[PDB]
Amino acid sequence: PISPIETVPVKLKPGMDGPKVKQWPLTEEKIKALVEICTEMEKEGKISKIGPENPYNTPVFAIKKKDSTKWRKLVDFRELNKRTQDFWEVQLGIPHPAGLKKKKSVTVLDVGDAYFSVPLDEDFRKYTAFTIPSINNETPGIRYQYNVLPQGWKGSPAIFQSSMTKILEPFKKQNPDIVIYQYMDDLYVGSDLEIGQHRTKIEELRQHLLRWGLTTPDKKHQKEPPFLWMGYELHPDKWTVQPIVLPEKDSWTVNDIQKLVGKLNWASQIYPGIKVRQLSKLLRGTKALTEVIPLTEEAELELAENREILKEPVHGVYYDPSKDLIAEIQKQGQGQWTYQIYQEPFKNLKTGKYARMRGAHTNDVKQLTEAVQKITTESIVIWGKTPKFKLPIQKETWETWWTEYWQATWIPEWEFVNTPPLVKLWYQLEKEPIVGAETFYVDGAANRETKLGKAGYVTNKGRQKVVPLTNTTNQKTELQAIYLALQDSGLEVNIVTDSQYALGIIQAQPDKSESELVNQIIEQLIKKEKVYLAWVPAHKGIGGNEQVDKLV
Amino acid sequence: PISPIETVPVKLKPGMDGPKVKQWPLTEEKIKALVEICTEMEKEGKISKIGPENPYNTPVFAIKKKDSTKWRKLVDFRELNKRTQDFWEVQLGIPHPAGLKKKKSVTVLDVGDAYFSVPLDEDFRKYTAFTIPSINNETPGIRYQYNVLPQGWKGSPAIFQSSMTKILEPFKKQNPDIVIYQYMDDLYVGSDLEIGQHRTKIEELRQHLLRWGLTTPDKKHGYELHPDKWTVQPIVLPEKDSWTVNDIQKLVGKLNWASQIYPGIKVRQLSKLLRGTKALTEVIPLTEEAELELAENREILKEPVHGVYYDPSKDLIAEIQKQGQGQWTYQIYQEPFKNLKTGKYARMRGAHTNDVKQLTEAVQKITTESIVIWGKTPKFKLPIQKETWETWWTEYWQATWIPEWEFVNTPPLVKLWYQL
Ligand SMILES: COc1ccc2ccccc2c1/C=N/NC(=O)c1ccc(O)c(O)c1
Ligand SMILES: OC[C@H]1O[C@@](CO)(O[C@H]2O[C@H](CO)[C@@H](O)[C@H](O)[C@H]2O)[C@@H](O)[C@@H]1O
Ligand SMILES: OC[C@H]1O[C@@](CO)(O[C@H]2O[C@H](CO)[C@@H](O)[C@H](O)[C@H]2O)[C@@H](O)[C@@H]1O
Ligand SMILES: OC[C@H]1O[C@H](O)[C@H](O)[C@@H](O)[C@@H]1O
Ligand SMILES: OC[C@H]1O[C@H](O)[C@H](O)[C@@H](O)[C@@H]1O
Ligand SMILES: OC[C@H]1O[C@H](O)[C@H](O)[C@@H](O)[C@@H]1O
Ligand SMILES: [Mg+2]
């Protein structure tokens, strides 16, 4: 109970004092349970009746559970925390399972009244002060103050996890052969030894823990093989996602989809190829919480497949240190790439997805690059090192793109993987003009107001065309022209644009866009043999551009 | 137990709280090194373990010196800095000698060790807390906070400023033509001797410092720099003989963007040949009234910017553009289109040199240049991916300080900067 640990000095933000909130003198069906409870804690040292002093107070409501013996005193420190100094924010992350080194036969421990077994700062105890009213409506209230962590006082998961560690510290030394994982009141002592001798140890940490004030359960040490954990299912030689509920409704809302997609994002860790692009493409109608959102024809087809995927249970393996990590990717199109990190055939530690960054103009190589990346940053967390990559692209296709990309990229260390689709740049622009190819001088503006434009051109051979556009942007007529030239022109052509934008979009060789316009342009590029795009400053006297620049 | 402990009490100015920065996830390799390092420092007394009652934390990395044998801890005190600045720049600031940039040779040497002998102000140590990460969040990271002036903190030097200059007191009288700017942990020695002798006066100082206080500098029979040599200013226009419509357009634009800086850049009679919807592959011999602009402008482009004056209240921006083939150009400035310097970095003796590596060096290069010319580090607009950078730089990076950086996706001037 009362741990002989040293205490962590605690205080309050500079210039504040204890919370002096009072008790709504309540009942006696409960101003009884309280006195029963408190007095029982009072014995165990968890608390001590405090004098007739200055101490502030805190509300002490009570409630009743549904399995039957009795009530719980639940003090509400909300106003004590507000005043309590900040703390070294504990592990905000969760130790993902695909990276806990396999072991023969693991154990687990469930620390007892953890919070209540750690002594509180002998000087910050006076701010834990509270009182329960009289057994009668008269008021000679009862006064107490905490001597251990309050149950949800601000600093508790911190000063606990702290003290815990400084205890396990000396144990782990005398036993450099056990990796004990810590998370909340859960210990993950596990190792690979005869199963009998091992227990001799768990029944040893336990002695040591209880030795110092911390208690642990026991069928002998309580849990069997199927462990639950923050959503995981950890077997003794495998981990997996706890079961998922992908529903079927006749009505969905902006609240029904976050649940769905949210549930869908989680399952992907191990469920290979969980497409969820169109479903999330929905959560942005508007962000109302409850909204009759009509499923789309594409989502219901996407969800139908996600279901078929989940209709079959898949497992996950544990990390083997000596063996290394290998990660492989594969593009599902639409900017939906899926991967899986492994060490051996048919044994993945985890698989995941890489969305399209929800942008407007990006080509596979770019994405594949950002894909490798996501996986890299991540592998450095779960495992600590980066993996060998098996990317669906040839060193030849890559070399091209980066040596010709204004940005400094760095795909690290890969091997080719022949399994279509294979990442490739579909169209390429002539680095220099083309001699025996007509030159289309294009341009197309539009009325920012009336939203009416016209795209067109004028060429050396003297051909001219002006196609009227309606309900268009300025950038729309800007690309409408390049697309128009690609139409009217022959097998190889040179285009002159006054459009910074138009150019860049194309000089981005961005395949896979949504915008029908781009794809038409992209499609028309494909068909062309040799194309050279040129940019000249408009409205600058080009006796050759100050043409379409005036025709449109 | 202990002698007269007089430490310079440090304060953050009113309204700013200690740093609370997230510790990055490191490779199991770097952790283990960072583990031994602190294990030893804690042992040395230099640092101490802390609890949860210290909400503060600055990121710490691990990088090789040049010795791909042993690692050295590099704490990213970029935040604890700005929050103490009024101290390391106002109160105990270090003046910057304008001549340093003139000497023919500048050798920069490490003095960081002279700092682990000076205790840090009790009531301040709490802000120098750092965490040594854990693989897969297995266990909670390790918590340490300093007990001596820590390298990287811009106060370590401002505090040492006295003991330091006092040590340089005999050497500077006797060699009165040498400049010595202390910028953080680095010490810059500038002079105008033979590149042979200049390596001797250094050694003298090297030896002087080594004795006087064992301020142990890491030399290596040691970083030569030649400030003067830095004079890369032209912006050559391709001056050919045969010009096609296409090449004239490429020139006008490349010439028009230009005028956004130089006032007298006149591109008119050039648009003269660009008259008429012509094929792009059509040679048009330069006119008579024409090449005026060819050279009349090439001239305004021979003699640089007139009216560009550095400002100490506004900070420095550094832009870098991948130029291709280990080719990297860059400009330092404050008011867009008013450069203080321009240049080029180069991959020269490395067949393992990749983009990132280059950029990391191209940057450190540009950073020392400023640290010399201006005594302050610029803020970089790195043309790389934020995620990729924040992962690899600490690989090839090997400086003792870290500048401010952000990330960009460049408007393709066709980099109206390159010459080839
Ligand atoms: C509060 O927790 C539960 C309540 C009811 C359960 C019923 C059936 C199986 C597991 C349960 C669990 C979870 N049990 N989880 C563990 O004993 C556990 C041990 C070691 C670790 O590292 C870890 O992350 C989780
Ligand atoms: O071992 C690589 C080899 O495995 C293949 C075919 O045998 O695919 C199976 O094994 C992978 C091992 O990582 C699993 O990820 C994959 O799901 C499974 O079908 C090929 O991917 C490859 O040639
Ligand atoms: O790398 C940028 C990234 O670094 C962080 C720490 O995780 O902060 C530091 O670097 C910034 C670079 O501009 C500084 O401005 C900042 O002061 C420094 O602490 C992140 O905040 C930032 O996203
Ligand atoms: O997380 C809930 C916590 O509730 C209480 O604080 C208990 O003392 C502790 O066992 C548990 O950790
Ligand atoms: O990502 C969403 C999921 O995260 C974790 O698994 C939570 O335990 C679960 O409640 C939730 O559905
Ligand atoms: O070859 C490595 C060296 O190349 C150049 O000198 C870089 O500017 C420098 O940072 C680096 O140490
Ligand atoms: Mg126009």
CSV table of all heavy atoms in Angstrom, one decimal, chain A residues 111-116 150-152 184-185, ligand 4:
chain,number,residue,atom,x,y,z
A,111,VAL,N,-0.9,-3.8,-12.0
A,111,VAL,CA,-0.7,-3.0,-10.7
A,111,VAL,C,-2.0,-2.7,-10.1
A,111,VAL,O,-3.0,-2.3,-10.8
A,111,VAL,CB,0.1,-1.7,-11.0
A,111,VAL,CG1,0.3,-1.0,-9.7
A,111,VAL,CG2,1.5,-2.1,-11.6
A,112,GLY,N,-2.1,-2.7,-8.8
A,112,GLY,CA,-3.4,-2.5,-8.1
A,112,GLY,C,-3.7,-1.0,-8.0
A,112,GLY,O,-3.8,-0.3,-9.0
A,113,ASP,N,-4.0,-0.5,-6.8
A,113,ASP,CA,-4.4,0.9,-6.6
A,113,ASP,C,-3.1,1.6,-6.8
A,113,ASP,O,-2.5,2.2,-5.9
A,113,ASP,CB,-4.8,1.1,-5.1
A,113,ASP,CG,-5.9,0.1,-4.7
A,113,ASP,OD1,-6.9,0.0,-5.4
A,113,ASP,OD2,-5.8,-0.5,-3.6
A,114,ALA,N,-2.6,1.5,-8.0
A,114,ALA,CA,-1.4,2.2,-8.4
A,114,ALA,C,-1.3,3.6,-7.8
A,114,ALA,O,-0.6,3.8,-6.8
A,114,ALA,CB,-1.3,2.3,-9.9
A,115,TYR,N,-2.1,4.5,-8.3
A,115,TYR,CA,-2.1,5.9,-7.9
A,115,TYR,C,-2.1,6.0,-6.4
A,115,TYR,O,-1.4,6.9,-5.8
A,115,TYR,CB,-3.4,6.5,-8.5
A,115,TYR,CG,-3.2,6.8,-9.9
A,115,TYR,CD1,-3.0,5.8,-10.9
A,115,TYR,CD2,-3.3,8.1,-10.4
A,115,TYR,CE1,-2.9,6.0,-12.2
A,115,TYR,CE2,-3.2,8.4,-11.8
A,115,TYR,CZ,-3.0,7.3,-12.7
A,115,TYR,OH,-2.9,7.6,-14.0
A,116,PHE,N,-2.9,5.1,-5.7
A,116,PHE,CA,-3.0,5.2,-4.2
A,116,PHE,C,-1.8,4.6,-3.4
A,116,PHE,O,-1.8,4.6,-2.2
A,116,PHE,CB,-4.2,4.5,-3.8
A,116,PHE,CG,-5.5,5.2,-4.1
A,116,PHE,CD1,-6.2,4.8,-5.2
A,116,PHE,CD2,-5.9,6.3,-3.4
A,116,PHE,CE1,-7.4,5.5,-5.6
A,116,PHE,CE2,-7.1,7.0,-3.7
A,116,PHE,CZ,-7.9,6.6,-4.8
A,150,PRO,N,-3.9,11.7,-5.8
A,150,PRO,CA,-5.3,11.9,-5.8
A,150,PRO,C,-5.8,11.1,-6.9
A,150,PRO,O,-5.0,10.8,-7.8
A,150,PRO,CB,-5.4,13.4,-5.6
A,150,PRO,CG,-4.1,13.8,-5.1
A,150,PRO,CD,-3.1,13.0,-5.8
A,151,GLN,N,-7.0,10.7,-7.0
A,151,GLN,CA,-7.2,9.9,-8.2
A,151,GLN,C,-7.2,10.5,-9.6
A,151,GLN,O,-7.1,9.8,-10.6
A,151,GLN,CB,-8.5,9.1,-8.1
A,151,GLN,CG,-8.6,8.0,-9.1
A,151,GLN,CD,-9.7,7.0,-8.8
A,151,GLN,OE1,-10.9,7.3,-8.7
A,151,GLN,NE2,-9.5,5.7,-8.5
A,152,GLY,N,-7.3,11.7,-9.7
A,152,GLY,CA,-7.2,12.2,-11.0
A,152,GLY,C,-6.7,13.5,-10.8
A,152,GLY,O,-7.1,14.5,-11.6
A,184,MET,N,0.7,2.5,-18.4
A,184,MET,CA,-0.4,2.7,-17.4
A,184,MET,C,0.0,1.7,-16.3
A,184,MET,O,1.2,1.4,-16.1
A,184,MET,CB,-1.7,2.3,-18.0
A,184,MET,CG,-2.0,3.0,-19.4
A,184,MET,SD,-2.0,4.8,-19.4
A,184,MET,CE,-3.7,5.1,-19.0
A,185,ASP,N,-1.0,1.1,-15.7
A,185,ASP,CA,-0.8,0.2,-14.6
A,185,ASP,C,-0.5,-1.2,-15.2
A,185,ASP,O,-0.8,-2.2,-14.5
A,185,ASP,CB,-2.0,0.1,-13.7
A,185,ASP,CG,-2.4,1.5,-13.2
A,185,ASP,OD1,-2.0,2.5,-13.8
A,185,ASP,OD2,-3.0,1.6,-12.1
C,4,LIG,O1,-6.3,5.0,-15.2
C,4,LIG,C1,-7.3,4.8,-14.1
C,4,LIG,C2,-6.6,4.8,-12.7
C,4,LIG,O2,-7.6,4.9,-11.7
C,4,LIG,C3,-7.1,5.1,-10.4
C,4,LIG,O3,-6.2,6.2,-10.4
C,4,LIG,C4,-6.4,3.9,-9.9
C,4,LIG,O4,-5.7,4.2,-8.7
C,4,LIG,C5,-5.4,3.3,-11.0
C,4,LIG,O5,-5.3,1.9,-10.8
C,4,LIG,C6,-5.7,3.6,-12.5
C,4,LIG,O6,-4.5,3.8,-13.2
